[PDB]
Each structure stands twice: as structure tokens, then as C-alpha cells.
Amino acid sequence: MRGSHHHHHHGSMDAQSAAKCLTAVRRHSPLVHSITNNVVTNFTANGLLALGASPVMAYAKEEVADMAKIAGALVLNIGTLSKESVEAMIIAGKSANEHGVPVILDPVGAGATPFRTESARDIIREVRLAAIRGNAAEIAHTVGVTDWLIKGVDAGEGGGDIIRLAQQAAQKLNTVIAITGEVDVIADTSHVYTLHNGHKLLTKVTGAGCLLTSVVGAFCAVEENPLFAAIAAISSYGVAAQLAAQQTADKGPGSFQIELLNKLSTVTEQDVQEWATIERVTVS
Amino acid sequence: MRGSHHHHHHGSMDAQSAAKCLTAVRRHSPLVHSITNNVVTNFTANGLLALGASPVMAYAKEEVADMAKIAGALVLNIGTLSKESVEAMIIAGKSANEHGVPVILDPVGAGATPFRTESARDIIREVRLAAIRGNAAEIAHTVGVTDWLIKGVDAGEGGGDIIRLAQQAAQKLNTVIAITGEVDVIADTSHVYTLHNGHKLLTKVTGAGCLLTSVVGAFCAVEENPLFAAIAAISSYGVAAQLAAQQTADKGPGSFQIELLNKLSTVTEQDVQEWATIERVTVS
Amino acid sequence: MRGSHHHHHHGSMDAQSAAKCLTAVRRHSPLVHSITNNVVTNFTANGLLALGASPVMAYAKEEVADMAKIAGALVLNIGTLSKESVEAMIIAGKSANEHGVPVILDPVGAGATPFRTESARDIIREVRLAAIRGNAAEIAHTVGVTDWLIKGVDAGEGGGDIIRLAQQAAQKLNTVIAITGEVDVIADTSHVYTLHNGHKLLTKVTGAGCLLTSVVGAFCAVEENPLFAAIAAISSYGVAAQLAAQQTADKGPGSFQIELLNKLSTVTEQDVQEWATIERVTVS
Ligand SMILES: Cc1ncsc1CCO
Ligand SMILES: Cc1ncsc1CCO
Ligand SMILES: Cc1ncsc1CCO
Ligand SMILES: [Cl-]
């Protein structure tokens, strides 16, 4: 089911190709194996079901190798990590690597404690990753940006710094780096894009980001290029979120959470084509 | 308190009696002890509360025997099992057995990985179960395929193939077998029934089956005969699910999940007596 | 971010001051580190985000000390405790004590099993707590090392005994004791208050109490006096609950839960000032 829905020889990844990827997810219902934190398990599963994917949660070292080998994508999330779960994530990741199943990492809280930072690097060192999704601070700490410079990530300013961070981190780790924030930045070793969809309400629902990383996995299961896969995932999620906010912005984060689940199931190819905002960044 | 709300010497289980058990659950608010997966814990607890029962979750080997013996029912779910949690489930089940507390099992994933099939089997070997609730494949692979026939060529589900599986499994494991899905069959050693109350939207809510097994536990806490208890539980859940679906319409799986919790609370004894569809199967 | 929003010199704690603390919580978005049960993690995080706080969940002994020292408050909840989690809770509490981070305890199920009663007591013995939040029975079983320690009249149920229970527990443990029920009673070593806000629908939402404890934590992060912080937290929460009920009372527990999250976000200073019912108990 891992097809090719876009190629740079035809131009920059765009809304139409993103919309195609979404339909492929609905069509193939990829099995997405998540080894995530216990604050977002139920939400992640429900979000994936709403979207049209097949979620599976298995954490036991006695069975993670077997589950990951048959999955369409593997997503590792250290939100509530333990030494045991980190072990399982690497066992699952190696099985995934051996079988060609793309692996996505969400380094939740990397930088907050040495344990999270090191566990994130342990995974990167022991597992080949198709992509890493996180906020600017988490990415900077994970890749090793020098202490004193990290501050350069604070506040909310853009136009190059965050864009360069993404490309430099991608070049260093040889993977796709997706930094979400006021403006989202996605890059691989030689290409960079900025995405402009979503709604601030997402910052008021726990797991909004964790679920997003799982959605990136679902798209990575049907699109061979993780960059394009991630761009389509984030754009689709963002449109779904904007549509959800229109119906609940005035009600509150509770109604919005529920409506996001509804929209992930009702958002159409037409919606993405019409509202997705994807911009290629001139790199040179 | 567990009593008898129906006897075979009073006819075959019917909606009338099912509604009576629902009222009994709400009147006694039985304590239902769950040792389940972290993907459905919150949803399971909220569903039981809405229904009218009192949920409690306890997993540590240092207390499961103590919590189980004071419960009205113990429910074991292997959704996100670990070697340690299964050992805890058995310790809990044995305490329940020694104190006369009904034990219900949900063999989630049995047949998907060897670890899961064997874990389900270990529990069955060490714990006397009042009932087992799961899908056809999970029941078949846990008991082991003996009878293969059902129907040739993809045409119809038949129904007799599942009825056969249910009763055979009930006889082999000497327990109540509740198989749910498109079919829906419940049976014990000498009796078999078919229920017809559900909705496809349940396939869009994670833990929809896990919560259903917990509800079966709530009913077994007040109805002495597990066959009657399971039938009442599933019928009531099914009616609630139908009402939730009506109210939901085309809103989405998020709205439906919320409405299911609402209806488990507002569904009435009269609603059950009216929509519960219970068919006793005449096999010979 | 921990300032003082009231002083007994200006009289007793009142709605006006409660309102100010709420605003303080939203201004600082205090980081609330919770080591809680797996049935309420998502609800707890979502509730804190809606309120305006910043939740973080960390449980591994490899990081709980590092996470606690940078938090605004530490919340310990034994709902689904394990030998490992209790150990981690104490490690986190000691670290928090070393840095002046307020620690709140929710002795869930204390008295139901010896392991929980013992565990609750081990934490109290090893960690200086700012406050303990639970129901009458849990507080009674926790402090009642002997059946005579807490002096009072033994009879059916309890009420006026609650105020006396609170006073004695607060004096014996040297901390703030918040007992919630149809009527809430909060006390420290020298003052006693009863609160009268909220709605019975809260008994139908799992984690309603666990979240409240976390909210007490968020307020303690911005108000140096734990008694005052606890009153403001419980009053604000109750008001949000009444407002949510008014719009959900006849829909069901599912709708209510969602509306509670909405209201924790939309409830204003004015709402608290007008609805919060705080009464100082003339004791002497
Ligand atoms: C806030 C939080 N803390 C640990 S995991 C988590 C969920 C990410 O949204
Ligand atoms: C998605 C999931 N993972 C383990 S159990 C479960 C719920 C089945 O609906
Ligand atoms: C009911 C329950 N059982 C274990 S923790 C818990 C959450 C408190 O509401
Ligand atoms: Cl967990």
C-alpha cells in the first residue's frame, strides 16, 4: 500500500497531492502500531479510527517485535517513558527496520530531564527513523544544539532560524524533521517547507501533538517519501482542526476535542485541496 | 446483591427480564473490579459510572486479591498485557473464585500474537470463569480450531456457524460464551441465544468491546445466572448504542462516543422492554 | 510564580480572593507534575490545560526527581499504585521538598485494601505535604492508626463529624486537609471552612476527584498559603461544575464531562466572585 503520490520532478509537494495521500489512508486503512505515553493512548486510538486507520497498542517486549513487523508504520512516543518501555521501543524499532516498516519518533519533553534527552538519543542511535516530530525546543535538545543557543528557540519568531534548525537537524540525522509551532517547518536533507494550517485550540487538548505524530505514521504507511507523507499528514490534520474550531471555538476545549475527532472522519479530499497551505522554501 | 431475575422454568430469557436486571444494577451499584488495558481504562470507568455501577481498577500483586474479594464482579482484559499483569490477573481471579465473585474474561487479540493466545489460555487454565466475551476469531483460536465448517464462498455469514462455535466452546470450557460482532451469539452448556441490538458506529470507538465486557460484569454482579446476566447486559448496551446513534446522526464518531455514555445513563427499563431483541435458538 | 493573594489579617478567605487566584493560575500557567493513576491521566491533563495550567506526567525513578524540582507543584495519586510507583512518588516528593515545590496527595481508595492504606501512610511519613485531598472515609482510614485516635461520636454516617475529622487530621498531620462530599470541608491547624459549590453529576465522571486534586496543585503553585489555595481551587472548580451542569443536567454524564472541560476554560473572575460560597466555621 506504500505508493508514490508525488515527486519533485513535477513541482513542489502541494494541496492536491496531500489530498491524494488522505484518500489512500482511507482506502488502505493502514495498521499503525503506537508505543506511546499513557496520557494519550485512548485519544490516539480514537483519532486514528476516526481518520480511517487501524490502531494497535502493544507494549510488551514479549510481543512488540511481532506486532511491528506486520504494521504499516511504527510510532514511538516517550511522553511517560520508563526503562522498560524504552527497551520495547528499540526492540520494536529494530524489527520495523528489518522489515521495512517506517518508524516515527515523538521526543516529548526531550530537554526537560536528562533521562528523556538521553532516551531520545538512544532510540535515534539504535533505530533508523523515517521522521521525528516535535516542538523546536525538543528537537534542539535531541539533536544536541549547544545549551546556550537553545534560548534562540524561545518566544515566537521565524523567517530563517527555525527553518535552518530543521534542515540542519535533518542533515545531521539523515531523516525528516518536522517542527510544529505557530508555523510548522518540515525538512529532509535537501528540501524545506513551511505549513500554515491548524488552530491555537490544539494547544488546549492533551495529545493533540501525540496524535498528530501517529497520523504522520498512518500517512507514512501509504506514501514512500516521508517528507511528502508528513506534509500531507500535518496539512490534513490542520484543516480538520480549523474545521473543528469553526464549530466550537466559542464553546471551549472540551467541545473542540470531540469535534476534532468528528472532523478527522468527515474531512474530505476537497477540503484539503481547498484549504491546505503548503509553501516550498527556497534553499540555497 | 446478586439474585435471580429469571428462571428457565419461567420461559426463555426475554427483554422483560433484561430490563429488570438493568434496574437491579442501578439499585445496587455493584463494585466492578477491572484489570484492563491502558487504552480503555478511562472509557471503561466512565461507562460503568454512567450505567450506574461503581468501577475500581487495581493491578498490583500486593492488592489484587484483596480488592477482588470485596468486589461484586472481576473483569480481566488482556488488551495491553504484560507478563506481570497476567500474573496479577490470575492472582485476582483465584481470590474471586474462592470468595464466590464472578470472573469475566475479554481475550482481546487472542490469535494475533502467540503471547496473547497463550495468556488467555493460562487464565482459563487457572481461573473458573463465569463468562467470556470476544469476537469469533478470538474465541475460536483460544479454544483451538476443531470444527472448521461454516460456509463456502463469500455469500452470507450464515449464523449457524457462529452458534455452533459458541455452544461448543461453552461446553468445552464449561462457561458462558458471548460472541459479539455482526452476528451476536450467547450460549452456555445447554442454551443458545442470538441478540440483535447494535450499530456499526461502535467499531469507531476504541474500547467499545472492552466496556461491553465490563457491563457484562456489572450484570453478573446482580444476576446469579451468567447466561441471563450476559444477555441482559448486551441487550441493554445495544439499545443504548442504538439510541446514541439516533441522537448522533451524521455528527461523527466523537459525538457518538459521548452520546453512548449519555444513553447508558438515560436508557430506561421501558426502553429495554421495548427495543431489546432476544432470540432463543432451537438447536437439536 | 508562587505569591500570596490573601492574608487572614484581611479577614477570612472569600470569593473575591478565590477569583484572584484563578486569574493568577491563568497568568502563570504553572507546570503541574502529576504521578497519578492510569484511569484519569487524559482527563487530568485536559482539565489542567482547559483551566490554564501546564500538565506534565513523569513516573520513572530515573527522572521524577529532575521533573519535580522544575515544577510549580507535585501531585501524588495512588488510584492504581504499584510498589514501583509508590517508590517513585516518594523520590519525587523528597526532591520537591528540597526545592520548595508544594506537594499534594490524593489517597485514593485508602482503607479499601491494606496496601493502599499503608502506601498512603508511607508517603505522608517520607514527604512534607502541602495538602491532602480525599473523601471522608479515605482520610479517616489514613489517619486512624487506632480506632480511638480521632475523637468523636460513633454513629450512622457522618457530617458534623467531618468538620471535627478535618480539624483533628490537620492537627495530627500538620497540613491542609480537604475532604470533599455533598458539603466540602477544608482545614489547617488553625482554621476551618466549608464550601458549597458543584453538582452531583461529578460523581458520574471518573477522575472528577483526581482532577480536583490536580487543580488544588495548580493553585498551590501560585498562592503560598495552601489553605487559601485549596479553597480557591475547590471553589473555582465547583462553580465551573455548576455552570456545566446547568447546561448538561438532562443530557447525561458524557455531555457533562465535556462541558466541565469547557467551563474550566470559560469560567471567569466575575463568575467565581458571584457564585463561590465560602464559609468560615466559627470554631473555638
Ligand atoms: C503533557 C504530557 N506529559 C507527559 S505526556 C503529555 C501528553 C502530550 O500532549
Ligand atoms: C486499540 C487498542 N489497543 C489495545 S486494546 C485496544 C482497544 C480495542 O478496541
Ligand atoms: C474508580 C477508580 N479506580 C482506581 S483509580 C479510580 C479513579 C478515581 O476516580
Ligand atoms: Cl499505564
Side-chain angles (χ1 to χ4, degrees), chain C residues 1 27 36 171:
Chain C
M1 52 172 63
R27 171 175 181 173
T36 189
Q171 302 191 189

Side-chain angles (χ1 to χ4, degrees), chain B residues 105-142:
Chain B
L105 166 75
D106 194 322
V108 187
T113 66
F115 180 49
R116 300 196 172 220
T117 306
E118 195 59 35
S119 289
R121 279 181 184 176
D122 278 342
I123 291 169
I124 301 168
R125 285 189 272 252
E126 303 290 305
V127 189
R128 180 173 54 262
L129 306 164
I132 301 175
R133 201 299 307 171
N135 66 45
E138 296 169 334
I139 294 299
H141 292 311
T142 299

Side-chain angles (χ1 to χ4, degrees), chain A residues 45 55-57, chain B residues 37 39-40 79-80 108 116 205-208 210:
Chain A
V56 66
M57 271 64 179
Chain B
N37 76 74
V39 185
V40 310
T80 56
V108 187
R116 300 196 172 220
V205 184
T206 192
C210 305

Side-chain angles (χ1 to χ4, degrees), chain B residues 197-273:
Chain B
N197 293 290
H199 191 94
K200 288 188 59 181
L201 273 171
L202 290 163
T203 69
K204 297 297 178 174
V205 184
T206 192
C210 305
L211 167 56
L212 174 59
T213 299
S214 305
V215 175
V216 171
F219 281 68
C220 282
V222 297
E223 170 44 50
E224 289 172 293
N225 189 317
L227 178 55
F228 299 169
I231 292 174
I234 299 173
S235 293
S236 299
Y237 186 79
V239 173
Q242 294 181 194
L243 295 174
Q246 321 292 186
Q247 166 95 295
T248 292
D250 300 287
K251 293 187 183 66
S255 288
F256 177 70
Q257 166 196 154
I258 296 314
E259 206 59 38
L260 175 57
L261 293 177
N262 285 339
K263 300 303 162 55
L264 281 178
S265 175
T266 59
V267 66
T268 70
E269 168 171 33
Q270 315 80 234
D271 289 325
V272 180
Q273 294 172 173

Side-chain angles (χ1 to χ4, degrees), chain A residues 9-69:
Chain A
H9 282 18
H10 300 134
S12 298
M13 175 61 188
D14 63 7
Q16 197 159 63
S17 293
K20 287 299 186 303
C21 291
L22 171 65
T23 299
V25 170
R26 266 71 179 273
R27 172 159 62 259
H28 301 101
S29 180
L31 192 69
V32 179
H33 179 189
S34 294
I35 301 181
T36 188
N37 72 72
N38 81 346
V39 179
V40 311
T41 46
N42 179 274
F43 189 56
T44 295
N46 278 319
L48 286 175
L49 284 172
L51 174 67
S54 303
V56 66
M57 271 64 179
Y59 323 135
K61 64 177 185 173
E62 288 73 26
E63 74 170 341
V64 289
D66 294 339
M67 200 69 92
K69 79 206 298 181

